[model samples]
Target: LVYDAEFVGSEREFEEERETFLKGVKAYDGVLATRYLMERSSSAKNDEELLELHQNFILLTGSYACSIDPTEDRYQNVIVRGVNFDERVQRLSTGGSPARYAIVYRRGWRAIAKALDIDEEDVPAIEVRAVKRNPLQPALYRILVRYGRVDLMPVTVDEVPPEMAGEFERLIERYDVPIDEKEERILEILRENPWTPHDEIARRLGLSVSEVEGEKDPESSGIYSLWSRVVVNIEYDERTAKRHVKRRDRLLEELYEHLEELSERYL
Candidate 1:
């Protein structure tokens, strides 16, 4: 992002401060990144000269499915703020390339956890306020959590702030429904696959095809019965479809980015 838009892969490649992904300048990482960047001459002449390194890596991993807005001067290239750590590590591991995003992400959480002197799951009540105040930006939540504020309010997931109705309805699915191990296994298989059917689910999970197809009581719920309940019926209204389309389009763009990066890693 500084002197080079391309990978220099020299002594500097290992240096976390130089690259955009390594910079982690946005989000909680900025607490450190801001200082690191400013330690430079004229702080790389402001954002014009400096780029958040994570954006480069995010671009590398993301799909460019739809045509980009040529008029747009800025694009998002940040690591997932609220995503689970194990998942992020898994993403980089499976991405067919290596970068410092994982290290920083892990270390950032750890550094914050240490400073706050609390478990990663713990957060101050102010953090809940921060997340809702800027629901779109998860980094704010992380930043507050890092500060080690504890037990601000004993809020439950069921407890809703009137302002957060929209935030709760994220473009992504939370799949918060909990179930026994069998239900978990079934869901793991179904969600893991791009497409799945009742017959296949039944066969794989050692249930009769009839069991999957036939109706079962909904009150307590049977195996296949619960299946129908949990599966996101692509069945929805115009507004719902539009949201899904928007989500997929954005993801499609990222998919394209990752594909090209991995392919062009060599011939």
Candidate 2:
């Protein structure tokens, strides 16, 4: 669609609201996600880079080579029933929007029910199956995992259109720490050595054990959640603090090679 190059790459205007806003959206809501994709596509230096963006989107939204989908009871995306409806009834149709998968998985099962014009009771019949490795992929997952949960309904970034200077203040007050000075200190510690535990950080900072625990308190507040979402390698499960460390060696790996002719038309 030749999305605008400048609009996508430019920093989000409302940075403070980024986490809250992005998470609230179950689907693209017609504008923001498309704008985001357009910007990425537009900013690409060449076709390959552009192809990468599309490829990533396909990974996030489309069925891929390795996933739970290949087996059975797959999540059924909304489909258009008539000719020309694919482009025409996009917001209401699954196949119509680039945002189809995000809506179904991130929001809830009912997200599909709404689009399909089905009753909430009927949603159970249609919205079946859970994907093991989500098609939405890590990029989108990280955005959500960071948001966590709050008491109120999250306002989408575009919903209210809601701050870096102010951001530091909130962190400072919320955690009751000197974030203006200590933010970088803690961040540096985590950045240099991610696996470092909480007690170690407390010791390095010359802070009391209780003080360090303050931020980690899941109920009230702390730098703990901050560290988890912002610093830790998201691919590493916090429960284990480890990576899959992709194996180079595998058995039955193309033991024999076969030759075949391939051709394609330019058109």
Candidate 3:
């Protein structure tokens, strides 16, 4: 959903009110944190520059927490702090701060509705104010979101859709249990870095020479057999030309150029 000036102010006020409401409320904490960095150009000397920067800042900051589910209660749990909008304009208008600056973070809210695939229009709460703070560098604002009582439902393999069961089974069959803990670790190393040489993987994961080679001898029992199976199945499919490749390429090129201009002007 698109946000405007009224929305920003309302969200900021809502967060403040919600925090006040939760002043004595109790809950557990299992937090998730993500950071975003925005840069402004050094030549920005006028209100237009500052307004452009501020507008972009608000868009980026607000969109970070806006989930598809508009009904989520956590939307109102955001706390906006640090540099207030008016104060920032004041500083920029007076030429009291650096022309190029950053807004370190805009935080708050559990993105629970997004995880559950709920519609944003169904979300009952409004956006909240983000708590801000001063940074080591001269900048506009650093916003953060801190939430509690977040509810995350656990999902198991059986819960997967029926149509996808065959694919899941293939994955399980491909990675059967290793001989022991050490062999399991070796398997993980191989899976993560397929390009790594067998000898390097063996050394890094501390597998014995016989185990790495998987000798035919009864005592050695061919440990390298698993690696053979894994590598054999790992091949790329042929790339087919997309129907809209030209259109997509042109659109992306335009977007990249526009962003490049914005970066040079602000960042």
Candidate 4:
């Protein structure tokens, strides 16, 4: 389907959202923001908080890759299922309105209005939300990595989505850290003994504290370049930090189940 050509009206509105979304993504390093929300979500003590974080993470990450672009191959296989009843049962099925992935991924509200054959002048109360976990998460991660924002890869192997598991492994091996034997050994020690004092590590390695620690002033140098990505220092309180790992897993599991049910029934 000729998506951009078939779509009409509200282009400016989508553009405005794109402008804002892009700005925010750049400001916060959208890749890190997405990872932060997903990883930090386990501290969400309530269902409302967890759901809010989930939706926020979805929209924030999708903001970058899902926006209108003429590049057909970008998200060709990333299907955007119809989220509303009429859009699903009527226009989508009847072929009156095509359910293009880009349209639903970025501009689903307009897609819904189009599906119902609503007028450009008419405004309808419609809403669309991203509940899928596959293409959205994995796609954004890959895009961000390709874009040279590899500050934080998923901490664990399972955190990598199945769709891009093999590719992501290759990415990690390539971009993770191509360091000298000395630096690699230092990194290994740091990972094995997290929060270990630099002086202690330096003594063990027969190096100066400054050599081991590097410069704390981030703009210049130090272990932070590698440590920030490899070992995460929990800034949250003990109670919140303690629950994060398990909570993040549970939340992801819940979201994956919903994604399965969504595509199964709606697509």
TM-score of each: 0.21, 0.21, 0.19, 0.24
TM-score of 4: 0.24
CA lDDT of every candidate: 0.29, 0.28, 0.28, 0.36
Q: By TM-score, who's the top model here?
A: 4
Predicted candidate 2 versus true structure: per-residue lDDT over 230-257, tens digit per residue:
3222232432211101110110011101
**Candidate 3, overall lDDT?**
0.28
Model 1 scores worst on lDDT over the 10 consecutive residues at 62-71
Model 2 regions more than 4 Å off: 1-36, 43-153, 158-168, 174-184, 187-267
**Candidate 1 deviant stretches above 4 angstroms:** 1-222, 229-240
* Model with the higher TM-score, candidate 2 or 4: 4
Quality of model 2 by C-alpha lDDT: 0.28
Query: Candidate 1, overall lDDT?
Result: 0.29
Task: Give a tens-digit lDDT track for model 4, residues 39-94.
Answer: 55444453444344444334333333223232222121222343332233232211
For model 3, residues 1-267, the per-residue Cα lDDT tens digits are: 211111222465455424422221111000001111132223335444333333322322222222112232322212224333323323332211110111122221212222222243633222322222111001101111111101110011222233212232243255553445655565465445433444676677576555664521112323333333332233422121122222323433433354456556544
TM-score of 1: 0.21
What ordering of candidates by TM-score runs from best to worst?
4, 2, 1, 3
Model 4 is weakest, by summed lDDT over 10 consecutive residues, at 70-79
